[PDB]
UniProtKB/Swiss-Prot annotation, chain A:
Record localization: Mitochondrion; Mitochondrion inner membrane
Membership in a protein family: Belongs to the eukaryotic ATPase B chain family.
Quaternary context: F-type ATPases have 2 components, CF(1) - the catalytic core - and CF(0) - the membrane proton channel. In yeast, the dimeric form of ATP synthase consists of 17 polypeptides: alpha, beta, gamma, delta, epsilon, 4 (B), 5 (OSCP), 6 (A), 8, 9 (C), d, E (Tim11), f, g, h, i/j and k.
Protein name: ATP synthase subunit 4, mitochondrial
Function: Mitochondrial membrane ATP synthase (F(1)F(0) ATP synthase or Complex V) produces ATP from ADP in the presence of a proton gradient across the membrane which is generated by electron transport complexes of the respiratory chain. F-type ATPases consist of two structural domains, F(1) - containing the extramembraneous catalytic core, and F(0) - containing the membrane proton channel, linked together by a central stalk and a peripheral stalk. During catalysis, ATP synthesis in the catalytic domain of F(1) is coupled via a rotary mechanism of the central stalk subunits to proton translocation.
Note: Present with 12900 molecules/cell in log phase SD medium.
Protein's organism: Saccharomyces cerevisiae (strain ATCC 204508 / S288c)
Swiss-Prot record, chain C:
Similarity comment text for this entry: Belongs to the ATPase h subunit family.
Portion held of the full protein: 33 to 94 of 124
Organism of derivation: Saccharomyces cerevisiae (strain ATCC 204508 / S288c)
Note: Present with 6140 molecules/cell in log phase SD medium.
One term under GO cellular component: proton-transporting ATP synthase complex
Gene: ATP14
Protein name: ATP synthase subunit H, mitochondrial
Single biological process term from Gene Ontology: cristae formation
Swiss-Prot record, chain E:
UniProt site (Required for activity): S32
Other facts: Present with 41500 molecules/cell in log phase SD medium.
Entire-sequence positions represented here: 376 to 460 of 545
Quaternary structure, from the entry: F-type ATPases have 2 components, CF(1) - the catalytic core - and CF(0) - the membrane proton channel. CF(1) has five subunits: alpha(3), beta(3), gamma(1), delta(1), epsilon(1). CF(0) has three main subunits: a, b and c.
Annotated family: Belongs to the ATPase alpha/beta chains family.
Function: Mitochondrial membrane ATP synthase (F(1)F(0) ATP synthase or Complex V) produces ATP from ADP in the presence of a proton gradient across the membrane which is generated by electron transport complexes of the respiratory chain. F-type ATPases consist of two structural domains, F(1) - containing the extramembraneous catalytic core, and F(0) - containing the membrane proton channel, linked together by a central stalk and a peripheral stalk. During catalysis, ATP synthesis in the catalytic domain of F(1) is coupled via a rotary mechanism of the central stalk subunits to proton translocation.
Disulfide bonds: none
Subcellular location as annotated: Mitochondrion inner membrane
Protein name: ATP synthase subunit alpha, mitochondrial
Superkingdom in the source lineage: Eukaryota
Species assigned in the record: Saccharomyces cerevisiae (strain ATCC 204508 / S288c)
Gene: ATP1
From Swiss-Prot, chain F:
EC number: 7.1.2.2
Catalytic activity of the protein: ATP + H2O + 4 H(+)(in) = ADP + phosphate + 5 H(+)(out)
Listed name of the protein: ATP synthase subunit beta, mitochondrial
Gene for this chain: ATP2
Additional remarks: Present with 164000 molecules/cell in log phase SD medium.
Species assigned in the record: Saccharomyces cerevisiae (strain ATCC 204508 / S288c)
Function noted in UniProt: Mitochondrial membrane ATP synthase (F(1)F(0) ATP synthase or Complex V) produces ATP from ADP in the presence of a proton gradient across the membrane which is generated by electron transport complexes of the respiratory chain. F-type ATPases consist of two structural domains, F(1) - containing the extramembraneous catalytic core, and F(0) - containing the membrane proton channel, linked together by a central stalk and a peripheral stalk. During catalysis, ATP synthesis in the catalytic domain of F(1) is coupled via a rotary mechanism of the central stalk subunits to proton translocation.
Amino acid sequence: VRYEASLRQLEQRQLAKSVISRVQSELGNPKFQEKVLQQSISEIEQLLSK
Amino acid sequence: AKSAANKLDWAKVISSLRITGSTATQLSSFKKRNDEARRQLLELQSQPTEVDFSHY
Amino acid sequence: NVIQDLYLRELKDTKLAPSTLQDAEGNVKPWNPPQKPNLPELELQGPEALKAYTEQNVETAH
Amino acid sequence: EVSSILEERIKGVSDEANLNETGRVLAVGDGIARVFGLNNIQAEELVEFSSGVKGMALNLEPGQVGIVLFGSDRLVKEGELVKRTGNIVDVPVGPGLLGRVVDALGNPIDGKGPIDAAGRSRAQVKAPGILPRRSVHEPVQTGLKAVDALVPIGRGQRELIIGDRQTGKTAVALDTILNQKRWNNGSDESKKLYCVYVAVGQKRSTVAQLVQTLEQHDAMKYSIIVAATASEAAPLQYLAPFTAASIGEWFRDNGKHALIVYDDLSKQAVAYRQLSLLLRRPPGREAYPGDVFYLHSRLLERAAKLSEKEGSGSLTALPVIETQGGDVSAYIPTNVISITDGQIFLEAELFYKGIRPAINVGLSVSRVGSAAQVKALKQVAGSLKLFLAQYREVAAFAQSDLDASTKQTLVRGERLTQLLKQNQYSPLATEEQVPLIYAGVNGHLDGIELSRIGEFESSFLSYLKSNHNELLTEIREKGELSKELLASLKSATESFVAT
Amino acid sequence: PTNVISITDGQIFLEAELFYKGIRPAINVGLSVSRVGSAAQVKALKQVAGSLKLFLAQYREVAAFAQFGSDLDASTKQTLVRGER
Amino acid sequence: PITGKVTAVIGAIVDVHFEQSELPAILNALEIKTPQGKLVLEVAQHLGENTVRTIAMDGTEGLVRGEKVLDTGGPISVPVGRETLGRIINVIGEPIDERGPIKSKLRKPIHADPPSFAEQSTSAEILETGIKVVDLLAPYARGGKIGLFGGAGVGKTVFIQELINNIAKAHGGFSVFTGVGERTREGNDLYREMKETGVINLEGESKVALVFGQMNEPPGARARVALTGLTIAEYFRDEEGQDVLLFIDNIFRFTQAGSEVSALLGRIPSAVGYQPTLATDMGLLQERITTTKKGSVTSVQAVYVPADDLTDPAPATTFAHLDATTVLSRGISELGIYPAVDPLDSKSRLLDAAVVGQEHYDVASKVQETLQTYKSLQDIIAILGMDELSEQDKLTVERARKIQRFLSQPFAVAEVFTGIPGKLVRLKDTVASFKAVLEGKYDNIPEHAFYMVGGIEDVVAKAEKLAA
């Protein structure tokens, strides 16, 4: 049971560093460009709801 | 149970007072008390042998 | 938005992680069976001890 | 598995904010961010930094707003966005905190999942008024014979557990919590004090031991432990009893009873000192904040025995105060002593000399005292107070040529002192307190030798249970010793003494 | 004084009352300590002075008892006589 | 890439102004190149206007206003792991052993959060020192803080070295000795003694990594040096999965340094001149020392109480985290015990039956009384003998001398010195050994048979050899 618990935390930290790898890919992508448009229109929707 | 045994034991200790030659008779009685008390804590120590494979 | 991007990216791109049961074994205690189911030893057989004992203690009542 | 739960958490990130009050840090030094912005800000409003640090805004200064960081300075940096949460300090309140060790914010640090929060109620709430109070009369047992008889404990009234540094003060308090299990198990909710332990400045290892002890004695079902550990930030430490108090209010408001143990206010003091000095507020006596009297009084006045019109409820409290080596004249002790009504004063010499509990009877007083006390237990313990008083005075007279009168006192007194020793983390029931004291009062124990007092005690209890658990049950249910019970009890004791 | 005491490796306390008592040096033998200790004094002088410290400490203890009055046992008065010398 | 200029040097406070408009964070380390020097400044406050107020670790001599300051980009990072073993490292993580570059792998930032409440182990455990008197009468906590009370000359260093030996044997650990504000004379002596004892073996593994902060270093360095040590111990716990010893000589210097730093940072003086931050300073130290699922850092903390006043706020705050006290004592050393751990003045909050077991606690309590009765009775014995005392009382008195003798365990470190074979009597074996003596099954073989021996078997073997 103890090592099983150790595996749950270890898996979480493994998938954590895998998430960082996904972050580096995202900030490179021209999703970086395309999501600026998404943010722009979203802010247009928000600020118009004001 | 132990209590039948022990009432007769300690009664016999107070009878053993009325004689001399109980030099190691009483020591045998003490030993019998010891191991009797040992099984009682033994019976209190036990957990069922198998794992609770329900939860664990 | 970005939530979706991360969500998508993480979920899709990782869904397997290492997991070897053998490596686990090193880190846990091994099951091994009990030893010595030894039957009790029999002692003080015969009235040899008793005859000796009646004689041995001079004080049988004083 | 681990992936699925994480995937759920990320999926549980949603939506977009509609921010409208922001700040930019002007300077952050010494945990005192001074923010430009936050035009509309409530006093002690929670503000959230871009780092995610939480703060309160204790100082609303004319040009800047002086946030006090609840996080570490490490993550707060100058110019940082300071979003305005827009809510003055509030903590979840509800029955959901039963069996939950929570930090000041309310986040379960025992990770038993999100609290079943029935309300969030403010951490600063004014104490019940003159007319909302109603006189104390309902006993609360402690399972410590000395506490229950020498200094009886009621409901909604506060008395100190004041004594020298780490003389296992926390143990004395913890014992009370354990004894509440006996009544708590009992279904009558006029027999359910839902205790709250407020661990202030206590190292996480210590609180782990506490948590473990509570779990072992299966007490985590009437327990809530508000924890501000040593590591936890000085604002959290400052607001920690206040936060705790709000938790108490829900029980009190519900008309239930509960006992909140603030342990130790000495560490609350140090935290306020740190805040005030760091916020450059004018210093005062013993470098403690000028309004420290006001702080302590606000906390200690929230403990209240309610009136029946406002629904008879209570919020018994028992602050534990750490004396700084015995200085009861020290500024923080003197203030607290004044504010509270009653003291129980544990004495270090006694502790070392193996008298545990180490209550110094002389320096223990209750100003509510016998007003709440089981009638039975009162009857057979007027004598006990007086006997111990004599024993103390004639104690030093042991130093030779000893009067017969002095020798009678010494024998009865020594046996009594031995009797009131009690093994920590073992509570007792009133129905077993009353017999033991009866023997001592009637001087039955005088015959028994000191070494055999201990053997006598347990044996007497078992003997009483075997011979007449009818007597015990009568004591328990009647709660008043009848002459017939005192007669029968004396007979039983005589019989026990004989064996 | 607090700062320096920590920094330094010994203290050689003098005492005004003992100055008046006529002990010059007025070294207050009990308060004076050498935390670098004996391994710096002459080997010969170490041998001879082995229990000198113990005797003086005993003299101090005995002297306190002596001033609370009452007749003292001869063994104690050996200490007292030696101590004075 | 992010550079600023010194704009004020006033004492050990250096105000660096960054023109970058992307200022270093709080607790980041800035570094200044100096002619014979690198000077580490730790960012203490942001004063705004992109001016940051920083506390100097190393000296501030001959600084020139306008000196270019390079942001190192995170807190001070110190080399960590096995490569640090047998090195003397200054606060800024550079080898001052002059055995060349440490050549470590990872370096870790010195400020690191204490483990979370959940992360902490929920059970108390006993660390087995092996040392008979220690394991029986003042049992060490596993991953707690054990206070060592006593100066030098009571065999403090030899005690420390035996602990280092024994843990290296019994728990296979490594140790960090952190000389916080140590007197450099004592530091030289210690380094020498550790090489002599061979806990530090120049060739081959050294059981201990030395981090030494002389008092000579400026206030900033003497404050932070404790955290440098702590970080190495954390690596040994988390990464190396050991039970670690963290000697901290001495806690009063931690407080004292913090006081000075606080004063320099211009926080209004707190009572008797202590820092206002006193509680949280201590909190950050003591909460990082803990048992975790990973392992434990057990800290042996020497405490020199200022002016023998142990109710000053620095002692009071210290005692709040000590879980045991070991009182090495002149008087006990007079009796000729190794170590010199006073059995009745060494207390442990983990003494109780709930921790050591009822059997052990009963035994220890019985021992406490067996000893204690002799210490009081010895006054009666010296006037009228132990023959005046009851025959059974006399048995306890005789047995007390046997117990006292039996409490001396010859030390493995002292094999180098005196030449008496080290005994590391296991915990279970220790309890059983004394239990047998209490049951009077060896109250029949010479008092001298118990003097300086190992297990109960070794009492027997010694008794046979005494007779022979």
